[PDB]
Amino acid sequence: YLNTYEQINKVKKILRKHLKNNLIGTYMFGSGVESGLKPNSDLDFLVVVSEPLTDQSKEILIQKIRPISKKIGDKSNLRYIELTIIIQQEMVPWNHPPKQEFIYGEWLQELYEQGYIPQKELNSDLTIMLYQAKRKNKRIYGNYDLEELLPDIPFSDVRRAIMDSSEELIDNYQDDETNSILTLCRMILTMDTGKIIPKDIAGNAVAESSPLEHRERILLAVRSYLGENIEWTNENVNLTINYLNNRLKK
């Protein structure tokens, strides 16, 4: 069917074909460029455009990227494709939270079938994305590197972007237990040392640095992201999520 080289290229060509010269650059970030592209990692694309997309231009992007990506239940070699589109002019003057023009994500697929087209939205998670992408990124198209397309984002805004998304996360940990546990730990480290680390090894770092009760649940979420079917319905994630939330507060 498709391997990851084909995935990189069809996504690369879908964007130059259906956005023409509105496309300034397309970049890859996340744990695929950071700490190596393991066969388990996800494909996080970042796309910079000049002018806004009209809803149907955002709709063909959904429909053509749709078969290219891995569905949540897919027990195959395909990996998730997460692409966010930002507009360069909507980025200066810098201001948290930043503006976002488009987003593809497979957690939004149930909404995609019902007719949802991601429209202009303010996302605070985007602040840490651009911060870690300005640092380490792989450019697959464009005449400029990502760092000359975004202003210097201050570390004062990531620290609040960390915590703004923190207490957004404490409310809706439900049904995303495995991922939200490891994300908070990555945020504990990103705001203590300043390094953004894969959630795989971010969990084990705080694991042995935390009480046993939460230690067990941190390591249980280490496995479930590596496959390893784990049913959280009787584990008390509320306690560990409450613990990591307060440990981050500083």
Ligand SMILES: CN[C@@H]1[C@H](O)[C@H](NC)[C@H]2O[C@@]3(O)C(=O)C[C@@H](C)O[C@H]3O[C@@H]2[C@H]1O
């Ligand atoms: C940070 N943005 C998203 C967002 O938090 C999603 N929440 C529904 C989150 O969802 C996941 O945990 C999923 O279960 C689905 C997967 C494609 O993305 C994973 O990472 C997804 C994150 O990348």
